[PDB]
Ligand binder design. Structure first.
Ligand SMILES: OC[C@H]1O[C@H](O[C@H]2[C@H](O)[C@@H](O)[C@@H](O[C@H]3[C@H](O)[C@@H](O)[C@@H](O[C@H]4[C@H](O)[C@@H](O)[C@@H](O)O[C@@H]4CO)O[C@@H]3CO)O[C@@H]2CO)[C@H](O)[C@@H](O)[C@@H]1O
Ligand SMILES: OC[C@H]1O[C@H](O[C@H]2[C@H](O)[C@@H](O)[C@@H](O[C@H]3[C@H](O)[C@@H](O)[C@@H](O[C@H]4[C@H](O)[C@@H](O)[C@@H](O)O[C@@H]4CO)O[C@@H]3CO)O[C@@H]2CO)[C@H](O)[C@@H](O)[C@@H]1O
Ligand SMILES: OC[C@H]1O[C@H](O[C@H]2[C@H](O)[C@@H](O)[C@@H](O)O[C@@H]2CO)[C@H](O)[C@@H](O)[C@@H]1O
Ligand SMILES: [Ca+2]
Ligand SMILES: [Ca+2]
Ligand SMILES: [Ca+2]
Ligand SMILES: [Ca+2]
Ligand SMILES: [Ca+2]
Length: 1052
């Protein structure tokens, strides 16, 4: 077997050697094998200058604009420069250029001690200095990238080995694989041979199925090779290296250890009789369990016991370890750094933590001391068993700080804390209590698992309610900013921001300028930055040290379900981690089992960031297990009723379903839903998207009705934000001065809205804008089939959410100048009516009932208490409180300045008016089982629409729900049918469709009088119904002695 070595004969020689008092620099640039003339290097030049570090340069030409330092000469291997030196010692500063641009960015320092002959060579885009053109030429023949994949015991997929006489897998336990001084690779290796990828590997990794396959000997000691670095190397029959790359081992890790590891349980598993610690680390060379005292002093370090079959490490001790802090000391090779790292890491299965997640803690969640009184008997206030039960789901998407950060009626020590939900006398809790009584059924919580983006050490944080002096002491960026003068003032940050409002504008966005600095060290963040998946966040607890947060979190859950009467949904973010690699403080999973828990680029091995951050790999067996095990704890130990999967689309459909099967065994009525957009991961596996999840029972947010009612889309910027009016803001019927929307375009949005109100079903049949008969799947949504679901319970409709601009801000961007304040409040209610009175599950942003504004901020995740403010004292809706963050909304400053002051900012009168409209809508939603049929087939048999086709009155939505003899059994003893009429237009409209039918206005709306969305509606003696501008009316056919004729769905 020939020894592999770097090129040594077919290598470029030296153009010239540096003589006395001079240096020489070669720019390796070999011409084509077909070249016939000397290459042109007239534009090639060097920028020479000497400073403190290097002053050997003799008379260095200044002025960067000078390009006169061109090549002294050139040959087939590139040009070269003869630099006049002042001495043959020290060094020189050089930057290779091609005119004015840099061929090599980084500054180059040529050390005369490193290269005695003062004759070096460099290459474009390398930045490294070589002693010869030959060495530089060989540099391209070293270990680079990581496009070789060891997918199973004996299969290695690597493009670089194709048609290569010598293909080997070199390995080193404690060293980095690299050619020695002789240019040879003396490290040990195993021979590879061309083979054909098996169906097994093909099915597991479809995206790698076309890669050249190589077979390892069956007697290969996989375990030992996985303990260190492995490099795939290829060379010619003569032993000259062709290429060498790093190896991605996730596949072989699953094939070798997954099954055995899946059968075990992880974390610090404490029982009253003892404790067993277990962590999966199949590639680690050593793992020690480090025990810390309360004061964080090492009490003991225990070498753990490795299980050969699973690659898991365990240690068993006594029950006295209850409450102890701990970390796992790892000795493991990390492919990113290429070295055997040594570091302590918290437990990925941690269930308790110290302040700021620095140490994990041993805990038994079953302990009565960690449970509020009566916890075990806590019941779910709303049923989720049948589809009809699920359809009644009406969600209020909330955030811990958004809820109480500004409520002065919430005790000061509970503001921004889980416990604020227990302050029964506060404006916030009383408000939620009334929303519940009116029909809101679920509270959805933005990230309450352990996030990383808020420092849990209180002395390291400064909030706007505190002195500016505190902000300066904890934030050095502020102290060195233009705001430094406020440091020794006597004002609070909030007071300063308030004073900056008058002079704030697109030309001087000073409010956001200061707030951007504040955001770095405040207590605010949505928290889509996972540090630990199965421990509550610490900053939301009154005491973040230890187990305390567990009981407080439970107390909150109990308060919501028992005292507020609502179910609880948790936002989970298993699609990515806060960080990866061997150095970041928050990298947990990627430190323990490098390159396994993250999804990597097939060629470079780099952790992908499509989610925003450090993409995870739910397709890998042990991560799928971690996810399922985590959900089990939130379900059983925290009694969560449902989960909203953030970026669920980055998860395999099969993984989400498997997790659901596992959790249903714990809570048979648990509900799963999430964002099912397109993750572009279809080449790797079938994704959990709106389309692929049809008929599975897993819900997905629908962007159809959302965009049709709000107007436009999430990618709009500039004037498009105003031009793209929606059904809720008068598309077609009340055009603003910039829009060019046609009647046809407006009617298309109405088609999408009606389809959504019927549950966005693929098979629901309706009459479209042109009078044509169409199935939901035939109504187009930006190029894709509109209706995608099998049952309405698989669809979550909404017109506002934490992401993107609030509904009020959108209406402010789109409303015609002539639409007065009162009309805009009704537009907000009309927009929400399409969701609340529809068959799909209803979802809404906390505060929509208060016309919530973020001062036009599109993505407010780190915009603090200021832009995310919700005033439960009802003074205003937080509109017009300063221009939004310039980094992301700066391009919208012009349009904002133009539309912002069209009308007055909402006050208590408007907020009370909107809350009334909102509670009327939610009360109507639950006033009859007809609004929430649940089953798709039933929706198709009972739901229909009027005012459709080419002769329709634009903006008028009329939906009928049959309960008559032709629909089947009477589901509502009080009525034979219901009519939902939403007149989203500035004209009064008269319905003649129900003449001689004895229609009556809902008792709930009648009770509200002139405060009803139906105020002014008239039901004439001839049976005609007239609706005022921007109104919503729910009419009913009273049921007599027996079931009536109802409102049968028309044959189409
Ligand atoms: O590195 C990835 C990107 O990360 C950052 O983007 C953020 C956005 O700023 C957030 O707003 C949010 O994005 C949401 C988005 O607001 C929401 O509308 C939705 O997008 C859907 C869309 O609604 C739907 O109709 C259809 O078009 O599919 C879209 C998704 O393809 O979901 C988004 C979720 O991403 O979160 C992302 C982070 O993921 C960063 O700002 C970007 O520069 C970066 O590219
Ligand atoms: O840390 C390395 C990475 O740093 C940078 O990423 C930034 C993004 O550019 C920011 O946009 C932000 O990401 C936020 C995002 O702005 C916010 O909207 C939220 O996104 C959620 C969304 O709300 C949710 O509904 C759903 O769509 O999922 C989204 C993603 O979870 O949360 C994001 C994460 O906090 O912050 C990150 C981190 O600083 C840099 O741009 C990256 O290239 C780099 O990898
Ligand atoms: O003048 C010494 C100075 O040279 C270089 O600075 C360049 C810079 O790299 C260019 O991008 C552009 O800005 O022109 C500068 C010179 O005018 C080095 O980068 C710098 O370290 C060095 O001090
Ligand atoms: Ca040399
Ligand atoms: Ca945290
Ligand atoms: Ca912040
Ligand atoms: Ca990809
Ligand atoms: Ca009935």
């Amino acid at each position: 077997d020939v020894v592999v070595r770097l090129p040594d004969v077919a290598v470029p020689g030296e153009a010239v050697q540096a003589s006395a008092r001079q240096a020489v620099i070669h720019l390796v640039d070999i011409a084509g094998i077909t070249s016939s003339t000397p290459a042109d290097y007239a534009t090639k030049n060097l920028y020479l200058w000497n400073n403190e570090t290097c002053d050997a340069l003799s008379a260095p030409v200044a002025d960067w604009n000078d390009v006169s330092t061109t090549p002294t000469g050139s040959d087939k291997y590139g040009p070269y420069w003869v630099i006049p030196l002042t001495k043959e010692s020290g060094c020189i500063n050089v930057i290779v250029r091609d005119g004015t641009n840099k061929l090599i960015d980084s500054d180059l320092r040529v050390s005369f001690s490193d290269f005695t002959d003062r004759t070096v060579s460099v290459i474009a885009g390398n930045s490294a200095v070589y002693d010869s053109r030959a060495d530089a030429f060989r540099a391209a023949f070293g270990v680079a990238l990581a496009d070789a994949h060891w997918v199973d015991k004996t299969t290695l997929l690597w493009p670089g080995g194709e048609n290569k006489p010598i293909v080997r897998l070199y390995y080193s336990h404690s060293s980095k694989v690299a050619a020695d001084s002789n240019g040879e690779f003396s490290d040990k290796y195993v021979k590879l041979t061309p083979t054909t990828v098996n169906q097994q590997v093909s099915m597991r990794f479809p995206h790698l199925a076309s890669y050249p396959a190589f077979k390892l000997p069956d007697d290969v000691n996989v375990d030992e090779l996985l303990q260190g670095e492995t490099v795939a190397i290829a060379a010619e029959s003569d032993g000259i290296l062709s290429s060498a790359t790093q190896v991605q081992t996730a596949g072989v890790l699953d094939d070798t250890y997954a099954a055995a590891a899946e059968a075990l349980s992880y974390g610090a598993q404490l029982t009253d009789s003892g404790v067993t610690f277990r962590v999966w680390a199949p590639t680690a060379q050593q793992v020690e369990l480090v025990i810390y005292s309360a004061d964080k002093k090492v009490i003991a370090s225990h070498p753990m016991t490795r299980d050969s079959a699973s690659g898991a490490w365990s240690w068993q001790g006594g029950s006295d370890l209850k409450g102890a802090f701990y970390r796992y000391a790892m000795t493991v090779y990390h492919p990113q750094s290429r070295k055997v790292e040594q570091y302590e890491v918290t437990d990925p299965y941690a269930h308790s933590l110290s302040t700021n997640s620095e140490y994990s803690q041993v805990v038994d969640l079953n302990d009565s001391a960690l449970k509020p009184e009566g916890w075990d008997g806590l019941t779910m206030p709303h049923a989720q068993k049948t589809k009809a039960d699920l359809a009644k789901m009406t969600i209020h998407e909330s955030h811990i700080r958004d809820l109480s950060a500004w409520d002065q009626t919430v005790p000061a020590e509970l503001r921004g804390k889980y416990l604020a939900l227990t302050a029964q006398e506060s404006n916030m809790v009383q408000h939620l209590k009334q929303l519940s009584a009116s029909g809101v059924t679920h509270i959805e919580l933005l990230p309450v698992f352990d996030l990383a983006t808020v420092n849990e050490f209180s002395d390291k944080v400064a909030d706007i309610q505190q002195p500016f002096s505190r902000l300066c002491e904890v934030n050095s960026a502020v102290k060195s900013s233009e705001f430094a003068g406020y440091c020794d003032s006597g004002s609070t940050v909030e007071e300063v921001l308030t004073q900056l409002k008058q002079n704030d504008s697109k030309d001087n966005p000073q409010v956001q300028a200061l707030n951007t600095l504040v955001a770095q060290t405040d207590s605010y963040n949505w928290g889509y930055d996972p540090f630990h998946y199965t421990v509550p966040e610490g900053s939301y607890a009154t005491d973040p040290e230890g187990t305390a947060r567990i009981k407080e979190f439970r107390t909150m859950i109990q308060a919501i379900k028992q005292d507020l009467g609502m179910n609880v949904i948790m936002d989970v973010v298993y699609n990515h981690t806060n960080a990866a690699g061997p150095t970041d403080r928050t990298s947990v999973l990627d430190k323990i089992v490098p390159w396994y828990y993250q999804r990597l680029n097939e060629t470079t091995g780099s952790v992908e960031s499509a989610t925003c951050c450090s993409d995870s790999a739910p397709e890998h067996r042990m991560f799928a297990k971690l996810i399922a095990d985590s959900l089990a704890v939130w379900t059983t130990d925290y009694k969560i009723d449902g989960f909203r999967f953030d970026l669920m689309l980055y998860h395999p459909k099969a993984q989400i379903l498997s997790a659901w099967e596992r959790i249903k065994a714990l809570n048979p009525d648990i509900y799963f839903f999430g964002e099912g957009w397109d993750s572009n991961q279809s080449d790797r596996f079938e994704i959990a998207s709106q389309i692929n999840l049809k008929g599975t029972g897993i819900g997905t947010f629908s962007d159809r009705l959302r965009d049709a009612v709000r107007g436009g889309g999430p990618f709009d910027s500039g004037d498009a934000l105003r031009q793209n009016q929606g059904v809720g803001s008068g598309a077609g019927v009340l055009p603003n001065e910039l829009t060019t929307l046609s009647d046809d375009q407006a009617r298309h949005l109405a088609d999408l809205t009606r389809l959504g109100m019927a549950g966005n079903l693929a098979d629901f049949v309706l009459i479209d804008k042109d009078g044509a008969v169409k199935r939901g799947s035939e109504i187009d949504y930006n190029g894709a089939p509109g209706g995608y679901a099998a049952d309405p319970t698989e669809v979550v409709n909404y017109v506002s959410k934490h992401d993107n601009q609030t509904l009020w801000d959108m209406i402010s961007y789109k409303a015609a100048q002539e639409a007065d304040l009162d009309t805009r409040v009704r537009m907000q209610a009309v927009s929400l009516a399409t969701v609340m009175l529809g068959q799909g599950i209803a979802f809404d942003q906390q505060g929509s009932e208060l016309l919530r504004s973020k001062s036009f901020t599109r993505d407010s995740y780190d915009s603090g208490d200021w832009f995310n403010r919700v005033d439960y004292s009802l003074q205003d809706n937080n509109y017009n409180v300063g221009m939004p963050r310039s980094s992301d909304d700066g391009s919208n400053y012009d349009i904002i300045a133009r539309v912002k002051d069209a009308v007055a900012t909402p006050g208590e009168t408007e907020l009370k008016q909107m809350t009334a409209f909102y509670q009327e809508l939610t009360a109507l939603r639950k006033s009859s089982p007809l609004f929430t049929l649940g089953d798709g087939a039933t929706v198709m048999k009972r739901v229909d629409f009027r005012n459709t086709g080419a002769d329709q009155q634009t903006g008028l939505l009329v939906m009928t729900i049959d309960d008559g003899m032709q629909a089947g059994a009477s589901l509502d003893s009080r009525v034979d049918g219901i009519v939902v009429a939403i007149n989203a237009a500035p004209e009064s409209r008269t319905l003649q469709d129900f003449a001689g039918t004895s229609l009556q206005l809902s008792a709930i709306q009648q009770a509200a009088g002139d405060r009803s969305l139906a105020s002014g509606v008239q039901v004439a003696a001839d049976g005609s119904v007239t609706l005022p501008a921007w109104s919503v009316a729910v009419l009913e056919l009273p049921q007599g002695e027996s079931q009536g004729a109802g409102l049968p769905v028309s044959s189409k």
